[PDB]
Design a protein around this ligand. Structure first.
Ligand SMILES: C[C@@H]1NC(=O)N[C@@H]1CCCCCC(=O)O
Ligand SMILES: C[C@@H]1NC(=O)N[C@@H]1CCCCCC(=O)O
Ligand SMILES: [Ca+2]
Ligand SMILES: [Ca+2]
Lengths: 610, 610
């Protein structure tokens, strides 16, 4: 594959280093050898290694200032030389010297005039899961990441540009946010800002990423709390300090949802990173989301539920009082078991009690069109995750609400044609319409976190486990059929045909029925033996499942599911504000006009320190 | 709303500070500016800010002794000036100087003759949940709360009054008890007591709150153990010290229940604060309550149960041997399913076996009147929580005991009228009369804590969850009805009408019935499919509930429910002593007369230190 390729080439490089006597001597710091290979013998100083590296590139990898200095003295054009291989296209000797924090070699290379604008476009410097580190493409980006404050200023002194962006359009500021050592990177972040021009506009912090993000905004998405906390000092203003109390004012500009999708809050709820959830708990955001749902948010969510419950409960009223079913053809004799009395083809009737039934069915096309006005913007504008990431209209579940309206439309087509299968399209809507009601259990009270468990269980662990429950049924259900195939099924015929054999055993797996048992007639010899094993094995599987549930329930998951529910409540609040009109739901905070301090909206939060 | 108002005004204040050049210079400590605004230009020194603040009020907020001193020198009448706004009505410059612990400014203000009796009646100084801190209304109250021992004595030296009460009638002593830093406040508590007159009477500790509480008494209600422990030294007397043993005598005056509702014990069991429960565990109280229930308490509780069980079991005897039911009208044919043989209108009968039935019914009016003598004092004197806080007659449950007597009275009205619904009023009393018997399981042995779980479950989590169980039934129960509406219900008609469809599915949710299944006749196509989903979903909901139970069971809750039960046993003991006559249940302890040490009752408790 591709992992083999890079593993092959690192091995292949070492052979070239061993074979090449010049490259070997630079690797091994043999100073006396290098003079013998350059002065007396005319070895081609511009020797190209396996990775297109120069003799100086190897002397920089393994820190070798003595061997590196000889190469610059004998040939000074090697400093500008970049590596030519695909994995390392663009990398220069200065990149290697900065990475290893070789201060004396960096100073010697800059004195030679090495470019501070050379990009390392090689694939190994790309931001990808297989790459272990991402340091950008510029030598200043490398210096800032390793934390050598000495080299960062020294690189700037020779003309390094902080505004320089990589292929992804990330400045050196953006690269620091995507780093493990958060505590060290904060101090380095400040140092790079000191070289900013000083103008309020064109500030490097305002320079955006290619995908529209900014350093402050990116920190929230990536879940870097340390940088998020540190970056907040820029945009928070202390009003006054009275004893232990402190009224502090927050800028609330890039945080709030006014700037279209540039809102930080939308990025948190849409992103897949679990880490970003902790950002909404932070003290500028936590008041914002709480004030959002406690007032203007919670009522509208319940109002929709009241409308939704009403819309559903009326639709069921149409189903229970459905067309008349008198059975015109008394077939009866063929399949004498058959008992049907069917509704079907009467094309309405005279309308006293019948009149109200049409007004209830007229509500179906409203939902069929309102949800069609939900399904039209189900591929319009958005459409891959951008719906599943934007869907807050229900959010969880509510993929089935659009299928429900399809069943409503199919049941309309089921009418006016009077097909036998009238019940099957009408039946699906009743289960799905009420099962979706518990989507409103999200938020509400303390059943919301409960609905998260079952929601997870339905779509995750069940499917895999259900396969294991599907097996063993195949063994026992088909077995029982074979034993009972011989005997007369008139009495105790739990498995008369194969589709009933599976269904009867499936019921038996959850012990719903009493279990097949007749004492008037003697049963087959094998039923008594095979059923004993079925009763035991079914209990073990249920006990082990019950014990397997304890895979969760650790106190951290009690905090986890609590944070997941409250995060999904915040999720509900944002798109409700998005779809709803601007006249309702006034913007949070107070405007910075009429007190000419800002021209933006500020949240006044006061706190107390114990 | 109102939170917006104060947020608006803090923003509005800063604009006035910026706009007002005088107020700005005091905020910014620009000393050179202040002289330019007062000497050369005649700026109206008595400038009123947005909050009615003076230029000195701003100079005190932000600690600005240099700017504050200039304002007093140019205009000395600003010191007496209070803020006029509603939020800050009454606050003076001395209040602000004390709060920020500006010692030099407090000394300068007192030298100017600032009042030490000025109250801060502004709404932001009220004791309310929205206010973060409560420091009282007097400048000495502020000094004591921040803990500046230097200012407290200095404020007293210039005529501060410790006896001064706020609008709620709380002294400075009461304010300290309602503070977070319990360990610091104890030392400050003593310092304020040193300035007391020294007379045993009129002591500031005896000064009561408006609602009848005193500092020692309030500490128990508020659950401040540190202050409760510290305050106990005042009223505990060591008899002797023999080796490691120590006989210490406790005053037991304000603690015990003799002084009407002033008893501390009644305040603990009646209050809603969870913290007060730990106070009853304290070593002066724990012996008192234990000695109370172990002797004189536990027997009377069981004696009432023996009487109650006897009263109930006889009442059931009347129900089982009820009027004769021969069915006079053999209607039968209309609703041929009907089978009734009804008792109804015979107006008693000749009395051999019948005579004893009346003597048992005569017991019903006794309970109907005895509980009427419980329902008459169910609005008399008390009545909102003052019953639910005073009810110990059962305590938990025993709201239903008064409804039981109502059903007894209704069943009496059901008799002498011979109505069809004879069973329905009589049936409710049997369930409620015996379900109330487990109220006596409170206390008793180790089932008492068990009864607390179910008691909590019935009235808390169930109702919310039951709604979620009510949903999904609507989908499946109504669905099953539709499938089976077509077919002949003579055989396997679990859902023949809609009210039976819900009830049959509700039973099926808990898997009580075998589940509808017939093999002689072929079932509808949809029943087999829809029932499979019902069996699965019902199990998940029950499994997730079982796992959701683990929301408790942490070892802290095992201590919590144990402390809740033992606290509710203490609850039972207090009102039993209240309702019972004084001749029974002698007062705990030994009187201080006949050993003229006290004239009050003392509990002799000896302890040993390891
Ligand atoms: C092979 C290259 N040639 C060399 O002399 N050092 C390089 C080794 C890899 C450094 C970058 C590895 C990475 O980014 O994952
Ligand atoms: C606004 C008032 N004017 C001022 O100069 N300081 C005050 C600030 C509020 C102090 C009390 C806040 C509180 O009690 O919650
Ligand atoms: Ca069973
Ligand atoms: Ca059964």
């Amino acid at each position: 594959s591709w992992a083999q390729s890079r593993d092959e080439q690192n091995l292949l490089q070492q052979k070239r280093i061993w074979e090449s006597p010049l490259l070997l001597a630079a690797k091994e710091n043999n100073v006396q050898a290098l003079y013998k290979l350059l002065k007396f013998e005319g070895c081609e100083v511009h020797q190209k290694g396996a990775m297109g590296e120069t003799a100086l590139h190897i002397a920089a990898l393994y820190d070798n200032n003595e061997a590196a200095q000889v190469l610059m003295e004998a040939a000074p054009e090697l400093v500008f030389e970049p590596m030519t291989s695909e994995l390392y296209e663009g990398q220069t000797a200065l990149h290697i010297a900065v990475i290893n924090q070789n201060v004396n070699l960096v100073r010697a290379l800059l004195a030679r005039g090495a470019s501070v604008s050379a990009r390392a476009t090689g694939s190994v410097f790309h931001y990808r899961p297989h790459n272990l580190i991402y340091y950008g493409e510029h030598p200043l980006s490398f210096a800032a990441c390793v934390g050598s404050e000495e080299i960062v200023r020294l690189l700037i002194e020779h003309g390094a540009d902080i505004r320089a962006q990589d292929s992804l359009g990330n400045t050196v500021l953006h690269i620091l946010i995507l780093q493990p050592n958060k505590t060290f990177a904060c101090q380095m972040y400040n140092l790079l800002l000191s070289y900013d021009g000083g103008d309020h506009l064109k500030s490097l912090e305002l320079v955006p990423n290619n995908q529209g993000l900014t350093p402050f905004k990116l920190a929230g998405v990536e879940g870097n709390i340390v940088m998020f906390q540190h970056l907040m000092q820029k945009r928070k203003h202390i009003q006054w300090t009275y004893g232990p109390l402190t009224s502090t004012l927050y800028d609330l500009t890039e945080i709030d949802s006014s700037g279209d999708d540039q809102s930080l809050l939308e990025l948190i709820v849409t992103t897949k990173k679990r880490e970003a959830r902790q950002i909404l708990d932070q003290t500028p955001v936590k008041e914002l989301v709480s004030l959002k749902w406690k007032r203007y948010g919670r009522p509208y969510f319940c109002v929709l539920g009241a409308i939704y419950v009403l819309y559903i409960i009326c639709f069921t009223m149409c189903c229970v009082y459905r067309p008349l079913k008198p059975r015109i053809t008394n077939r009866t004799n063929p399949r004498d078991n058959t008992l049907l009395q069917q509704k079907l083809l009467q094309e309405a009737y005279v309308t006293p009690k019948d009149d109200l039934r049409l007004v209830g069915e007229l509500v179906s096309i409203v939902g069929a069109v309102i949800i069609l006005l939900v399904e039209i913007p189900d591929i319009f504008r958005l459409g891959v995750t951008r719906f599943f990431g934007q869907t807050i209209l229900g959010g969880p579940f509510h993929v089935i609400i659009v299928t429900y309206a399809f069943m409503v439309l199919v049941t309309m087509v089921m009418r006016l044609t009077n097909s036998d299968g009238e019940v099957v399209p009408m039946s699906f809507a009743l289960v799905l319409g009420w099962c979706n009601v518990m989507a409103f259990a999200r938020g509400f009270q303390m059943l919301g976190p409960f609905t998260i468990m079952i929601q997870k269980m339905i779509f995750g662990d069940l499917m895999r486990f259900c396969w294991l429950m599907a097996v063993v049924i195949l063994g026992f259900a088909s077995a029982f059929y074979i034993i009972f195939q011989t005997e007369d099924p008139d009495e105790l015929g739990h498995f008369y045909d194969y589709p009933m054999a599976l269904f009867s055993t499936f019921e038996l797996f959850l012990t719903i029925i009493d279990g097949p048992a007749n004492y008037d007639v003697d049963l087959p010899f094998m039923y008594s033996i095979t059923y004993a094993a079925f009763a035991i094995i079914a209990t073990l599987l249920m006990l082990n499942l019950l014990i397997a549930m304890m895979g969760d329930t650790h106190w951290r998951v009690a905090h986890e599911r609590d944070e997941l529910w409250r995060a999904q409540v915040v999720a509900t609040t944002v798109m409700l504000e998005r779809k709803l009109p601007r006249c309702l739901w006034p913007r949070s905070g107070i405007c910075g006009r009429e007190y000419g301090l800002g021209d933006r909206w500020f949240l006044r939060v006061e706190d107390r320190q114990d």
